[PDB]
């Protein structure tokens, strides 16, 4: 079975060449693929990795499974190192690359046995790749289904399917998607990107989950501690002060107690202490601040001056939120006031600019809402739910559901998953093969067949009959190519993939199974390049 007893090539070692090393290479690459194969897809099963000491871990991460696999043949190490490189360019797909690469090598070995030279297999595979990539560009789509319809809600519903909030996903998934669509922005130099850390989250147990609110702006958890001011200020526009340093009456010192026998002296002290802090208030008023957001609070005498000036002083603001409000309004978060000997805001230097500020009551919560800043690209969601337990879990599900949708939206160039690209390529490359008429079509046809290992593996991991699902999958894609040259159809049949939960063929674009373009182009090339490196080995010397 093993390749030994060379009895040729008088060197200090053995010689393995020809069909011997070629079959050995096939066995090695299959041995590696047989380990990672079952991790493909969200429905797949994990595997156990046990070390030489006595410890183990269980994971479905293809990168970890491959890296921690004991591989005694360099033919398999090439594919493990390939996956390690994949992580450094894409960050995912390691499982699908090894699976494809193994199938291509196995198929190639059959071509060799049928008297197709390895050089013509390598050539044909590369020719197929060039057309395969060009095909991906045709099924390529951008961010769609946001105007007049939403499919992004199926992305959020999927991410919430394991969360307590999932029961109300028919109502909340709109908030996840709408919160993100409303804040589509540009970070720098026209990148065009959805915000990473946008959409603040609050909670209150005042009503049922369907009463959760989406606010187009910052909901700052704070109050004004007085009814003197109206709940709506700055009809035309607002200057906003985002301050940390308090506006409390001056003290002689925190460790000193004022002991006065003559009331006249105490009144003089209290008035001077007010006079000191009023320097901060007066400069805030003179700088035109209509809303004063102070973290450590505003004194009663200081608020009085603001109220009389028709300025809304806000007490007990959250500094962490002011960091984002300040930037959104163009303001500077003031950790301390000073100029040289006195203190000031330098004539609206620390202040920002925004449209409207309102004081909203949320039924057991209370915020000052900052809406319409110079540039915010953010929002706030206030979560409601069955009980406090659900509120904390709902926040976690919101953070996750936002991340999943943003990752899909992060790429402006996406392709359907679920085997759509692989099965669609299967049809296209099978047709391409017929236009050669010489030798390459043999490798091209086998290349197309190899691509089907992915929709096959996904079905197996779903506990479904992979033969019917793949046959039906290909049938839809074949139809989408039949009408392609004419554009005459009742249905495009295009982008239909494997539903790995219900076991049927679905429209993946609406279902929400999307992968970025770069994943499919890189995966096809990565698998091929490793295959070529192994197919080029017709001799091994073992010293």
């Amino acid at each position: 079975f093993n390749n030994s007893r060379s009895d040729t090539l008088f060197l200090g070692g053995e010689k393995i060449s020809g069909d011997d090393i070629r079959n050995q290479n096939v066995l090695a690459t299959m041995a590696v693929a047989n380990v990672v194969k079952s991790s493909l897809g969200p429905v797949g099963l994990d595997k156990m990795l046990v070390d030489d000491i006595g410890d183990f871990t269980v994971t479905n991460d293809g990168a970890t499974i491959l890296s921690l696999l004991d591989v005694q043949h360099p033919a398999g190490k090439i594919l493990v190192e390939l996956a390690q490189q994949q992580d450094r360019e894409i960050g995912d797909g390691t499982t699908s690359v090894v699976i494809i690469a193994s199938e291509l090598l196995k198929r190639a070995n059959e071509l060799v046995k049928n008297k197709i030279h390895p050089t013509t297999i390598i050539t044909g595979f590369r020719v197929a790749l060039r057309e395969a990539i060009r095909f991906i560009n045709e099924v390529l789509s951008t961010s769609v289904d946001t105007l007049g319809k939403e499919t992004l809600i199926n992305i959020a519903k999927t991410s919430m399917s394991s969360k307590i909030i999932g029961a109300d996903s028919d109502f909340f998934s709109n908030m996840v998607v709408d919160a993100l669509l409303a804040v589509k922005t540009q970070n720098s130099k026209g990148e065009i990107k959805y915000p990473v850390k946008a959409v603040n989250v609050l909670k209150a147990h005042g009503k049922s989950a369907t009463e959760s609110l989406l606010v187009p702006g910052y909901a700052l958890n704070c109050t004004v501690a007085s009814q003197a001011m109206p709940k709506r200020i700055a009809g035309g526009n607002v200057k906003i002060a985002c301050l940390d340093l308090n506006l409390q009456k001056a003290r002689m010192a925190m460790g000193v107690q004022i002991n006065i026998d003559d009331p006249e002296q105490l009144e003089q002290i209290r008035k001077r202490e007010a006079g000191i802090v009023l320097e901060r208030v007066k400069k805030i008023i003179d700088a035109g601040a209509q809303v004063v957001l102070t973290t450590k609070g505003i004194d009663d005498l200081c608020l009085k001056e603001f109220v009389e000036a028709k300025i809304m002083g806000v007490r007990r603001c959250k500094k962490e939120d002011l960091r984002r409000i300040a930037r959104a309004t163009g303001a500077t978060l003031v950790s301390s006031m000073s100029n040289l000997e006195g203190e000031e805001t330098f004539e609206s230097s620390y202040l920002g600019l925004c449209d409207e500020v309102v004081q909203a009551k949320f039924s057991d919560d209370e915020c000052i809402l900052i809406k319409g800043t110079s540039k915010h690209s953010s929002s706030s969601i206030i979560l409601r739910g069955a009980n406090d337990y659900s509120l904390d879990e709902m926040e976690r599900s919101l953070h996750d559901s936002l991340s999943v949708v943003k990752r899909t939206l992060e790429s402006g160039n996406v392709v359907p998953g679920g085997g759509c690209v692989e099965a669609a390529l299967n049809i296209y490359l099978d047709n391409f093969a017929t236009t050669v008429g010489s030798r390459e079509q043999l490798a091209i046809a086998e290349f197309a067949a190899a691509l089907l290992i992915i929709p096959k593996t996904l079905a197996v991991n779903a506990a479904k009959d992979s033969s019917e699902l793949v046959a039906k999958l290909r049938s839809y894609h074949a139809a989408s190519q039949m009408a392609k040259p004419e554009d005459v159809k009742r249905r495009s049949y295009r982008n239909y993939g494997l539903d790995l939960i219900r076991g049927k063929i679905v429209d993946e674009i609406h279902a929400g199974v999307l992968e970025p373009t770069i994943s499919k182009v890189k995966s096809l090339k990565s698998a091929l390049e490793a295959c070529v490196a192994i197919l080029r080995i017709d001799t091994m010397i073992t010293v």
């Binding site: 696999l69 591989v71 925190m254 460790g255 406090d388």
Partner: protein, 518 residues
């Protein structure tokens, strides 16, 4: 090298079944003994389920996962060590023919097990009965369940007192729409912390509301009780103040040495003046206190406690409310500790302590154990922990489940009723849990010495037609009512037992390959 496909499934279940067998004799008050044969010339007869699993090496990683199940159970609740291991093993055994004979994909197996868990959890609640956890006498009867058949049975009145008062104090009994709902969260390990002080006897132990500090004081004779307590927490020591920059002092005349000494005294005083300015009554500093500082503060009408770590100052801050301040000069007048009943500095067992007992319950307490020797102190502590674990399990939920295998049999019968209504391939692995649950009433009969089939069949029939309080008499082996023969256990244990047993089985069932590598 590796075990793939059905090799992993058979190997994982095979090992887990072997682990379950080890401890099948450990169930019930009539548990039988096992002989543990060491690599050395010794042998251990200890029948504790934890020790048996700990002291017996296992080979297969699946068996090691089973060991982790028991370790997790021990951390979550005070019991169930053998229940989760026996049950999880039987669940795997019941799923075995479905993976092999029926060729049911592991994905199908796992889905049904999750559904069976949900239903099992409901039934455990339905068959349970409430107890008024606010009736101390009723609680004492429950706590004694874990104290009897032990040498310390004659302590059980005091053990119940210590356990019940401490857990009630720390129980986060709160609900509101703003600060959230702790849902009666109890963590006795962090909040009920117990301290052992030499001297006295078990009857002299007390639960304190506050912090018990083991550090000594600057003088043994200081005020013990304060009318208006004010507490200072400082890091920085009270010693000669030095600058941060370069200083060069050149003395020629000896007379100027006294001037330096006077300055050194002043700098220490100035630190104490800032402390005294805010009219404190107890000052705690992490670092030391100079001899001058000791007199400077005491003469001001306050007590001084030294060498108290930040970790203790955090506890002091919770029960006093005092803010920890690093630099002495920055101490604020807002640092208070009022409504504190005592600052007692009593020396107990020839060791100095400091007590901050107050009238507050800031989600924490300390148990102070007394005893005439370290052995007595350890014996009280080690046995008290059992009482406290039960007090936690009961006070965390007023529902008690029937024992003697009754609860597990009720789950078996009720799951069977639902199984007939479950459509699809999942019907098969769903039954697996329904049958597996009966490993408990079955094992109890075997360890009692009865007929595992004839008595189990009668037990099932009683639940099928009658009530769910029918169980096995541990001593007689007869089928008896669990209200007449009270063997009731907190629901908390039963819910976690079935939960972690099924989840553990799922972790092994879903692994179809074990491969080697580093």
């Amino acid at each position: 090298e590796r075990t793939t496909g059905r090799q992993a499934q058979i190997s994982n279940i095979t090992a887990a079944k072997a682990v379950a067998d080890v401890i099948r004799t450990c169930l019930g008050p009539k548990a039988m003994l096992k002989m543990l044969l060491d690599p050395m010339g010794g042998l251990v007869l200890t029948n504790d389920g934890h020790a048996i699993l700990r002291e017996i090496d296992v080979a297969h990683p699946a068996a090691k996962s089973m060991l982790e199940l028991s370790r997790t159970q021990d951390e979550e609740v005070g019991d169930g060590t053998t229940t989760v291991i026996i049950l999880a093993g039987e669940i795997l055994a019941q799923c075995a023919p479905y993976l092999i004979e029926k060729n049911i994909h592991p994905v199908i197996i796992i889905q049904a097990l999750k559904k069976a868990l949900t239903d099992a959890l409901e039934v455990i609640k339905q068959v349970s009965k409430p107890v008024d956890v606010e009736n101390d006498a009723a609680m004492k009867k429950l706590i004694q369940a874990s104290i009897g058949t032990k040498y310390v049975i004659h302590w059980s009145e005091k053990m119940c007192e210590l356990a019940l008062d401490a857990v009630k104090t720390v129980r986060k009994d709160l609900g509101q729409t703003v600060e959230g709902e702790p849902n009666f969260e109890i963590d006795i390990k962090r909040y009920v912390r117990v301290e052992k002080i030499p001297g006295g006897d078990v009857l002299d132990s007390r639960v304190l509301k506050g912090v018990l500090l083991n550090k000594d004081v600057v003088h043994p004779k200081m005020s013990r009780h304060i009318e208006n307590p004010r507490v200072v927490l400082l890091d920085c020591p009270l010693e000669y103040k030095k600058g941060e920059s370069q200083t060069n002092i050149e003395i020629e005349k000896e007379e100027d040495w006294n001037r330096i000494l006077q300055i050194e005294e002043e700098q220490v005083q100035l630190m104490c003046e800032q402390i005294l300015a805010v009219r404190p009554t107890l000052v705690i500093t992490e670092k030391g206190v100079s001899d001058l500082a000791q007199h400077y503060l005491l003469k001001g009408g306050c007590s001084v406690l030294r060498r108290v770590k930040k970790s203790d100052n955090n506890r002091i801050a919770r029960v006093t409310g005092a803010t920890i301040v690093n630099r002495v000069e920055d101490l604020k007048e807002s640092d208070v500790g009022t409504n504190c009943g005592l600052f007692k500095v009593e020396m107990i067992g020839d060791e100095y302590f400091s007590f901050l007992d107050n009238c507050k319950e800031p989600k924490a307490c300390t148990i102070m154990l007394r005893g005439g020797s370290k052995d007595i102190l350890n014996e009280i502590d080690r046995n008290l922990q059992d009482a406290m674990a039960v007090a936690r399990n009961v006070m965390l939920s007023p529902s008690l489940s029937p024992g003697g295998g009754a609860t597990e049999m009720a789950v078996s019968v009720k799951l069977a009723e639902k199984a007939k209504q479950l459509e699809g391939i999942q019907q098969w692995p769903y039954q697996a849990v329904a049958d597996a649950m009966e490993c408990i009433p079955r094992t109890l009969i075997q360890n009692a010495g009865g007929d595992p089939i004839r008595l189990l069949s009668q037990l099932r029939a009683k639940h099928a037609q009658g009530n769910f309080t029918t169980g096995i008499d541990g001593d007689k082996g007869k089928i008896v009512d669990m209200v007449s023969y009270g063997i009731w256990e907190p629901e908390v244990i039963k819910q976690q037992s079935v939960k972690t047993a099924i989840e553990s089985a799922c972790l092994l069932l879903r692994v179809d390959d074990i491969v080697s590598g580093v």
